[PDB]
């Protein structure tokens, strides 16, 4: 009750004395651990280590079925640290948990863990694609409801379409920028738009201009300046063919006139776009 500081200070001293005696007795006979646990119902870290250092798989279940909230402590002790496979499966609870969820019959949990890992990862395009593929495979293998399966398929297709804009890079730009093939980080929408409309991409046709303008919805700074810069680059790369193709593929008030100009071909191309969009 009163004077909680003394109770908190004595608890640490009592727990430190039990851990030192269990370390010196672990090198001898293993029969004293059960007697110590029966005498004092505390210090479960010693029992968890004794049940993991040997090939006694039933001991961990026997010490957990006859206790009070022992699985929650065992999982916390395993996550903070035959027999080796069991120890690895017990420790696999965070981060790398997809294999454990697949082995313990949990396709939905494995898919959720893979999706979380893919969302948290942002430094390896190959790893992000592999995690998304594993999550899609787990969602397809899971026997859930039709609406849930359709929602998972839509969420996977959205991520695939968002990642394709960065995965479909040109072979000339990647070789000129001295970039890695699969050892590259997850580039953002602005980085992809800047790389697709850069000076290194000499073979920038209509696809490179259409892929850069469609990535403006995944920015979450100023898109008005980027829209003008891309329009200026598409006009300068044509050497006054690309602007007309982009306008035909986009089919109209997002572009500017005076802001983009601050001349003979633009005035003739802007007059035909107003009649086709009305």
């Amino acid at each position: 009750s009163n004077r909680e500081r003394y109770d908190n200070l004595e608890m640490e001293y009592l727990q430190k004395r039990s851990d030192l005696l269990s370390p010196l007795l672990s090198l001898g006979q293993y029969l004293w651990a059960a007697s110590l646990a029966e005498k004092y119902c505390d210090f479960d870290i010693l029992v968890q280590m004794c049940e993991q250092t040997d090939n006694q798989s039933r001991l961990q279940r026997y010490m957990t079925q006859f206790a009070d909230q022992n699985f929650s402590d065992f999982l916390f002790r395993w996550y903070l640290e035959q027999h080796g496979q069991l120890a690895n499966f017990l420790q696999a609870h965070e981060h790398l948990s997809w294999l454990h969820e697949i082995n313990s019959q949990e396709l939905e949990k494995a898919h959720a863990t893979l999706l979380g890992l893919a969302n948290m990862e942002t430094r390896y395009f190959a790893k992000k694609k592999t995690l998304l593929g594993l999550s899609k495979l787990a969602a397809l293998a899971s026997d859930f409801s039709e609406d849930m399966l359709q929602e998972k398929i839509e969420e996977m297709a959205e991520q695939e379409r968002f990642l394709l804009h960065q995965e479909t890079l040109p072979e000339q730009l990647l070789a000129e920028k001295q970039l890695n093939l699969s050892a590259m980080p997850v580039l953002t929408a602005p980085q992809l738009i800047g790389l697709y409309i850069c000076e290194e991409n000499r073979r920038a046709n209509e696809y490179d201009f259409k892929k850069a303008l469609d990535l403006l919805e995944y920015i979450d700074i100023n898109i008005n300046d980027l829209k003008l810069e891309i329009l200026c680059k598409a006009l300068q790369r044509d050497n006054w063919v690309s602007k007309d193709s982009i306008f035909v593929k986009i089919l109209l008030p997002e572009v500017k006139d005076l802001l983009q100009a601050d001349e003979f071909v633009l005035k003739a191309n802007y007059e035909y776009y107003v009649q086709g969009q009305i």
Binding site: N88, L96, W98, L99, I102, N103, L107, A110, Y124, A126, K127, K129, T130, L131, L132, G133, L134, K136, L137, A138, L140, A141, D143, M156, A157, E160
Partner: protein
């Protein structure tokens, strides 16, 4: 009956259709020897002589897919036969003599090159089988057992047979590729098949069933565990 159609140069399209049907019937019941005998009996220069129509382009595509599948099966069988015949170790004997020690030393010296040659040949066979499986799976203009022309006649039974053969060949090819990657020590290549079998570029997830998906998930976890125990992580990347 295929010989009478192959001997006549006027019915080249009919002979090609008969050969494709025979190959499909042999693949539907697992008849590699029959498929090879039909491919060796069919004319190899018929594609350069019959040339187009919907009944001809689809037959040519089916014949090309059957030939690619037969080549991938023949390469996989050769790789398995080469991997199942590795060089054994030296026969150790306790309390040896002067001549026995020299014999054991010579055997150990010869094994140092025998094991290296067997590993090189196994790696070459695995690299060939992987390329064969990739060429059989990722096929240009459609895919494996997929007709590019959609203006043929009413061949519902033929379409169903081609779909069943493709569904039966996709899981077997995936399992063979996974086994080859696990035997050759390619954990990164084995764990990368999940994206290829789930991307929308080929739609390989629709041909697999629940058992095939469970087997693929069990193989991916076993590959990730080996990659993490070797020194890497789950996907094979370095733990920074």
């Amino acid at each position: 009956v295929i010989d009478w159609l192959v001997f006549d140069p006027a019915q080249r399209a009919e002979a090609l259709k008969q050969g494709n049907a025979i190959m499909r019937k042999f693949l539907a019941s697992k008849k590699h020897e029959a498929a090879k005998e039909v491919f060796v009996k069919i004319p190899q220069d018929s594609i350069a002589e019959i040339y187009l129509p919907a009944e001809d382009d689809n037959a040519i595509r089916e014949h090309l897919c059957i030939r690619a599948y037969l080549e991938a099966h023949e390469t996989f069988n050769e790789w398995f036969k080469h991997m199942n015949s590795v060089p054994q170790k030296p026969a150790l004997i306790p309390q040896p003599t002067f001549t026995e020690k020299v014999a054991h030393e010579h055997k150990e010296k010869k094994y140092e090159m025998d094991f290296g040659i067997w590993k090189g040949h196994l790696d070459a066979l695995t690299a060939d089988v992987k390329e064969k499986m990739y060429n059989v799976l990722l096929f240009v203009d459609g895919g494996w057992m997929v007709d590019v022309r959609e203006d043929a006649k009413e061949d519902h039974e033929r379409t169903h047979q081609m779909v069943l053969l493709r569904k039966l060949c996709l899981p077997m090819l995936c399992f063979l590729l996974h086994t080859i990657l696990h035997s050759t020590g390619q954990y990164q290549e084995c764990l990368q098949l999940a994206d290829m079998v789930s991307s929308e570029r080929h739609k390989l997830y629709l041909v697999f069933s629940k058992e095939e998906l469970r087997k693929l998930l069990q193989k991916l976890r076993e590959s990730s565990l080996m990659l993490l125990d070797q020194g890497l992580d789950p996907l094979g990347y370095e733990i920074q």
